[PDB]
Amino acid sequence: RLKIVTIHQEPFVYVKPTMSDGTCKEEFTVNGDPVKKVICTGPNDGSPRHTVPQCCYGFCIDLLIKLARTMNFTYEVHLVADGKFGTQERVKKEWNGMMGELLSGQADMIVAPLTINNERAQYIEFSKPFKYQGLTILVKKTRITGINDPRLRNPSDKFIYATVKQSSVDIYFRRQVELSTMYRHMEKHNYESAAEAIQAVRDNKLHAFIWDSAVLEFEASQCDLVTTGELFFRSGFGIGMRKDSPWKQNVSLSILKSHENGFMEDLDKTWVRY
Amino acid sequence: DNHLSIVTLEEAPFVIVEDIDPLTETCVRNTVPCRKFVKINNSTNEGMNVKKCCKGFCIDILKKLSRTVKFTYDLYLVTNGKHGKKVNNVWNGMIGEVVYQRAVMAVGSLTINEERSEVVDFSVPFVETGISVMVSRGTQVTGLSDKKFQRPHDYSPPFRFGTVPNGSTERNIRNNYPYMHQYMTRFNQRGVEDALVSLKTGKLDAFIYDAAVLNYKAGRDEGCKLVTIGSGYIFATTGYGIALQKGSPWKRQIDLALLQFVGDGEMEELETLWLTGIC
Ligand SMILES: O=C(Nc1ccccc1)N[C@H]1C[C@H](C(=O)O)Nc2cc(Cl)cc(Cl)c21
Ligand SMILES: N[C@@H](CCC(=O)O)C(=O)O
Numbered sequence: 169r170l171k172i173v174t175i176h177q178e179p180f181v182y183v184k185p186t187m188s189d190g191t192c193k194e195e196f197t198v199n200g201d202p203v204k205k206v207i208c209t210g211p212n213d214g215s216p217r218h219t220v221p222q223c224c225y226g227f228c229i230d231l232l233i234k235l236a237r238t239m240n241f242t243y244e245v246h247l248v249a250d251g252k253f254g255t256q257e258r259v260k261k262e263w264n265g266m267m268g269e270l271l272s273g274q275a276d277m278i279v280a281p282l283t284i285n286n287e288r289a290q291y292i293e294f295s296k297p298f299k300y301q302g303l304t305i306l307v308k309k310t311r312i313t314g315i316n317d318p319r320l321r322n323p324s325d326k327f328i329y330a331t332v333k334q335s336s337v338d339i340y341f342r343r344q345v346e347l348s349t350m351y352r353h354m355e356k357h358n359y360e361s362a363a364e365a366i367q368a369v370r371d372n373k374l375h376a377f378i379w380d381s382a383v384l385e386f387e388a389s390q391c392d393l394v395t396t397g398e399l400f401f402r403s404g405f406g407i408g409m410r411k412d413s414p415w416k417q418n419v420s421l422s423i424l425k426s427h428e429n430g431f432m433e434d435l436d437k438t439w440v441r442y
Numbered sequence: 443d444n445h446l447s448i449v450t451l452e453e454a455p456f457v458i459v460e461d462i463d464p465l466t467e468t469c470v471r472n473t474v475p476c477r478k479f480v481k482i483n484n485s486t487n488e489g490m491n492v493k494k495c496c497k498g499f500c501i502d503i504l505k506k507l508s509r510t511v512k513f514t515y516d517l518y519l520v521t522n523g524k525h526g527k528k529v530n531n532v533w534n535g536m537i538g539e540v541v542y543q544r545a546v547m548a549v550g551s552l553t554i555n556e557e558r559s560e561v562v563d564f565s566v567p568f569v570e571t572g573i574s575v576m577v578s579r580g581t582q583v584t585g586l587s588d589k590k591f592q593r594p595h596d597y598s599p600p601f602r603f604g605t606v607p608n609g610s611t612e613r614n615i616r617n618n619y620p621y622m623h624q625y626m627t628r629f630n631q632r633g634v635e636d637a638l639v640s641l642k643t644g645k646l647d648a649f650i651y652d653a654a655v656l657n658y659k660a661g662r663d664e665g666c667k668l669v670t671i672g673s674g675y676i677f678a679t680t681g682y683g684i685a686l687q688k689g690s691p692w693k694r695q696i697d698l699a700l701l702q703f704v705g706d707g708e709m710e711e712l713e714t715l716w717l718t719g720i721c
Binding site: 252284285286287289290294296297299315316343344346347400401402403404420421424425426427428429432433 | 523554555556559560564568570572587609614617620677678679680681697698701704705706707709710713714
């Protein structure tokens, strides 16, 4: 049985408690199909982290079930114990989150919206992307062309834009010299969570929210808000495996086959488009 | 040795071929040397390598990889076919050049798909692509699965739609939708420019083709009349990748270098420099 690590990240992985008999509540998609759910063990919340069975489903779980059937492997799913995707932190840096669990052997496969980047690829093997990634901008149903719009490039208090404090976006902007002016503007307005930032766009307190395009398109599926402009800072989400994994070739070939036959587009229409 | 044979193929704006300055015989500005084999006549296979110059999105990527990965190269334009097709069990095109060890890598608008990945290794995708559908503004098509495409003779008159054959897009249609594929062949287009003219003049209702190229053409279309359905919607999302020989020693550093370019914002910048559209 392959040990799969995942993380709570809607709409790719939903995490919900089991029902009172320990099963997962039977539910259905917008297209009218039953939601496939797997039990995923993980923490519940300087407090003890009691690990309990929970119900996991979404884009990434649908993909896992496909891969498992297609490549004839068995699996057990758990939620990353420290709640993190995976950054190198110094104690001699060490990987936390899903990256550290994969490298330590606590997981054999990362199945999650794990952004492909150079730092992680130095240490692990990514598949070909199962979903292409980028940033976009969430606004009230307001035109912004994207990262090169004058109201972003030349910021003023008349048009407030922000992201999530300490997020990957926050870090990414701090890193590029050319984004210095936008970074300092966001720094004055960044929110503690995505949910709060999205609520502030609804309430005309934040005019534009810079965040992952898949999440933001998922959000615009409620609609008073919309995504706007061209995507920017694009990359992809891939399945993560150790360098030695005998699965990596067929995992990546299966992902190509699922893009090419429309399986992946179906996933987008079930979980991201509405 | 770090001097590599690399094959490419003209397809603007990814690879743009220009004539060399004949006095100086040196490529300047943002271009690099690239040669093309041209036959003397139709009686024999004798030919000459013409010295030409190449530029574009993929050429800037090649130049950056040459610097960071530390190699030099002899860039040539493929003349045995185009991107890559298996004909009578023999790959031609850029894929064939790599499969048969005439090129260490293939750099261009080369789509990553499953069948090509069985015979070559691909780098990480360095730009997103897939299949899009271009129409004249107002033509209604829901997507590839529109029954105007799937069951074309359910409609009178039938929808007129085609692709440029022998690439990844036709391969996908042929595999997924056999009735649609056999129907489209009568609308096969010799190239993208032919197809765009056929669309603008009403001789074709839809043109199905590589998403990166179609969305670049829509952005440049005089009058902004040619559009990709959805709003640049991409079916069968994939990417352009560098093709390398199976088990190539260069793949790891190429991969890491391309991801470094992403991480430093340079791919975003290249995308804005070459692929921006007026429309
Ligand atoms: O930065 C974050 N989370 C975060 C939130 C609050 C504080 C710190 C971090 N998530 C990003 C990056 C994450 C990754 O691959 O590291 N993938 C990933 C995938 C999707 Cl689908 C959406 C996002 Cl936003 C993200
Ligand atoms: N980029 C395509 C060619 C154009 C197409 O068929 O869409 C390929 O690599 O085959």
